[model samples]
Target: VKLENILTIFVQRAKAKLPQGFTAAALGNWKGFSRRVDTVMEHYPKGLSEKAIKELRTAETKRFTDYAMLGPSDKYNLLRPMQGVDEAMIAPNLVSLRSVVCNVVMRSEAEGGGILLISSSKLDKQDFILPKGGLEKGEIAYGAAKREVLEEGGVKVKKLKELGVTLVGDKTYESFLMRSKKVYEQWSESRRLRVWLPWDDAILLLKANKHDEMVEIVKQARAAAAAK
Candidate 1:
């Protein structure tokens, strides 16, 4: 029932799951795992059976592989995929913000030469989506956007300015208005059609379907473009 004892059990469980040279960082992110283990351990006052613990140990290990490949800092706030977990389970502070930022990557030959938009077939309707991803364990705020832009838009990006932070959480997703350095003939995510539109048309298209938050970000990017 003690915290120390439970962590010992988890550490053993983790060692078997993780590869050689694993660090304690994996243990740190398993807040939910600890909570569940605590509850389960409580239920089995005497002790857990080998089968029960085996199934349970492997339960959370699925979250490990992705955590292993981890972006920028394997030691930092490596983000977990949001699917599967329920609100009933837990919402840890760092994970609560989603830790995902985005960029409105644009060609700056002139005031809004063309803003980049990608084709997305999301739930409910097939439409456009922005280049977005976690801040790679917060290694660099701009770095996340730039890499995401390169991944989705197949272009090297130069961050111009912070469009603004999302209201839900403090700088959870601080999107930026970025300028394109150069677009390649092809790069990652080339399957998705990349469309470049002028400021007015991009805003107009977004208004029709893209969420208001997305529309406003682009509008703010336009305002910044005009000022430049």
Candidate 2:
């Protein structure tokens, strides 16, 4: 019973219980298991530590790494002889067509640190988020920010101070912070809706939804605001 590395024996014992551990790890529900865990964590005050704990794939899902499963092909194989890949690998003007999600994190002009929560008709219809969209045909990040504001929120801004520009991730984002104004007082498109809440309330509601990259943007916005 003197086991130091539970890494090996732990899994072997797992196999002892679930002849289906491999199966559950394979086709069985994953996030379904977590909702069960979320129910358990409601009682246990001392929950699992999440810091430095990156997620890992199970053995069954790990099967996709094989070059064999890439595609059904003989000539166009992913493992198509790794030698001639030198000059042949050079791609021309290969840029992503997808633009950065332009996130607008604005402050209130009228009253108490109010944060705007707008209903998004374009993406998540049910979810309320800071108005956001891709940099439409333009590279200036804040231009999209202002555009999304005017278009979706029907509001305009004084000046959009850059929160940050994230260019690495696939759904990368750019955030801006500005005190707002009801620019287009009466508008035509009545599809979406907007509301203002206390800044704290807005943050709590925002995090209550999914991680839509604006969390990191707002995280940076907090830094920009307090530096004043």
Candidate 3:
């Protein structure tokens, strides 16, 4: 199916109860002719039509500007709910928050020519994602990512290389470099950590491996003319 049709179907499925053809109708309430479309186009890593990009920028600017009028902690908390999970999860009966695991394919341009690929270990079967566990009391997201990575991959990573953050469904993520400088700089026997996680990163970590789904997401973005 065409990408537009696929997106339309997803929108319909996601917001089925809104109203008949609400997606099309909602466009009228947006800033201008193409503003709503532009927001949709932003999801495409490949550069979109000029009209789409313009509309996206305008709508996003408006959204952020309106959001800024709220308050200090409110603004920060609104944009970054993951930063303070407790506050975000405070509400009851009406969808209290829960932790979820998601994946990120970290690719770094290599010194010579190709790219370096790193992915977190896969944990729960609920999602085919980088294994991330619920934060223990007083635990930080970075610390959780580090622990999950080491537990699943059997390797330790030092300083983190932060990647762009993205939200998937109901979860917010702060994706980062799971491989330490040492993992790239030196060689050593591969340590076998606990295999509690059902999925393995071994096959996908190889320099040549490109078929992995998460890796393909990064690959397509790189090949695209531009990524937002």
- Return the top candidate by lDDT: 1
Model 1 Cα lDDT, one tens digit per residue, 4-104: 34334544665676666655465546555556444533432233344433433342242233223331122133233344445443222322326767778
TM-score of 2: 0.50
* Candidate 2, backbone clash total: 0
Model 2 agreement with the true structure over 1-228: per-residue lDDT tens digits: 111233234344444544452542332343333333243233322322232011111111221211112212132221212224344232222223256655544555444345566654431123567777777564577766766666556566655467666754655666677667544433322234455555555555467566446566666666676675
lDDT of 3 by residue, 37-123 (tens): 455344533433343334335433433222222212221122212233343232212212354322232323351212222222111
lDDT of 3 at 126: 9
- Model 1's alpha-carbon lDDT is 0.55
Q: What TM-score does each of the candidates earn?
A: 0.51, 0.50, 0.30
Cα deviation at 115, candidate 1, in Å, is: 0.6
**Most TM-score-accurate candidate:** 1
- How accurate locally is residue 136 in candidate 3, as Cα lDDT from 0 to 100? 59
